[PDB]
UniProtKB/Swiss-Prot annotation:
This is Nicotinate phosphoribosyltransferase. It comes from Saccharomyces cerevisiae (strain ATCC 204508 / S288c) (Baker's yeast). GO terms for biological process: NAD biosynthetic process via the salvage pathway; nicotinate nucleotide salvage; rDNA heterochromatin formation; subtelomeric heterochromatin formation. Transiently phosphorylated on a His residue during the reaction cycle. Phosphorylation strongly increases the affinity for substrates and increases the rate of nicotinate D-ribonucleotide production. Dephosphorylation regenerates the low-affinity form of the enzyme, leading to product release. Belongs to the NAPRTase family. It is found in: Cytoplasm; Nucleus. Nicotinate binds at Y18, F180, T232, R297. PANTHER family: NICOTINATE PHOSPHORIBOSYLTRANSFERASE (PTHR11098:SF1). The gene is NPT1. Coiled coil: none annotated. One of its GO terms (cellular component) is cytosol. It comes from the Eukaryota. Its main location: cytoplasm. It catalyses: nicotinate + 5-phospho-alpha-D-ribose 1-diphosphate + ATP + H2O = nicotinate beta-D-ribonucleotide + ADP + phosphate + diphosphate. 5-phospho-alpha-D-ribose 1-diphosphate binds at T358. The lineage of its organism: Eukaryota, Fungi, Dikarya, Ascomycota, Saccharomycotina.
Amino acid sequence: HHHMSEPVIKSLLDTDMYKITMHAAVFTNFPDVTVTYKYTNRSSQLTFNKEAINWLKEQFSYLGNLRFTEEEIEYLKQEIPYLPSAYIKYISSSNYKLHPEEQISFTSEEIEGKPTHYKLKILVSGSWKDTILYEIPLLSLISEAYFKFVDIDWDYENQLEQAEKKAETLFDNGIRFSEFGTRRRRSLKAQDLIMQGIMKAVNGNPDRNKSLLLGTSNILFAKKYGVKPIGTVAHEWVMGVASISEDYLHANKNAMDCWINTFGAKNAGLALTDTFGTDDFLKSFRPPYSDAYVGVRQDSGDPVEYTKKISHHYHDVLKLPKFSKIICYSDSLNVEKAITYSHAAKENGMLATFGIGTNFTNDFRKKSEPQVKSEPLNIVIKLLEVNGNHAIKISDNLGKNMGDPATVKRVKEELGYT
Ligand SMILES: [Cl-]
């Protein structure tokens, strides 16, 4: 007889802070809009078994049992005080919950020519306010499933020490960074152990190191370890804003307006510039917008080239003093890259911060072959459709786009790239 598994996702705060701020933004501005997200496994030679699938089915259902506790809501009000009152009331209500049975469509398919091996098919669809939170916990669960049931050639030895060493190097180089690895963690336990390592590093020289650790994107771990939760706007914000009525020409400005009108200009945070290409973004990035945002988040393309472009914009076009604004580098970082990019930022008169994700929470060697990498699962859950319209991303890697090709072509034309 089957015994029910212990739920892995024990809190609606076991997620990235950007999910909650998006949730507040979507609730506030677009409570009616409907969306679909889609899972994609970019590592398609990595496959699933029946055991993993059955555990996933169970774990997904448990998401429907979660509620924000009193202490959790208090934590949100304290650390994210600019969340609107009405949003807090909405998530505080006894009416609030996730409905995975209605929102998640999870099937699996035996792979042609690979019997006993399966690919996952996952669509998450419904009102945007009902669907926005699933991305992170679903990814966190799928990764955990894969390393629990499919690839077990690995263990936890030296995970804390490895994270500690990374953190110590970063701190010696005066690097201001946050942990950002929730979505691709090998397991909840893996992320907890790396949090332990980072804090062990901090507490070796807290007078110096406390101010270098910005915090973690994971609100639950921020709460647990007594550090700040860290978040920015995500791509899905301007993608949704554009797709609602397919006004791409004004989407960057409309998205900033809406963000600012929701949280307040002072709480605008870092701007994500590359969604429809950084050039389009820059056309509207002047006062008051460029004064409200405290900087920009770099998420694609060549980081050094990005840094030069942004520096010229701020210092030459906008006539701001050097070191007025931040670039946050967040695309597949490791310690050596963070150091290199910190140099480029300094050279170009920019303050630098870093979000370090998968390298923290999914850096494992094989147990069988300790010199060989145990590869992470390269999975995403991406916004696909909004009110029936295609959702797309251009990025700054200009021929590496996301979404319906015809739409991407049409948009590049409308925005003057082509
Ligand atoms: Cl898959």
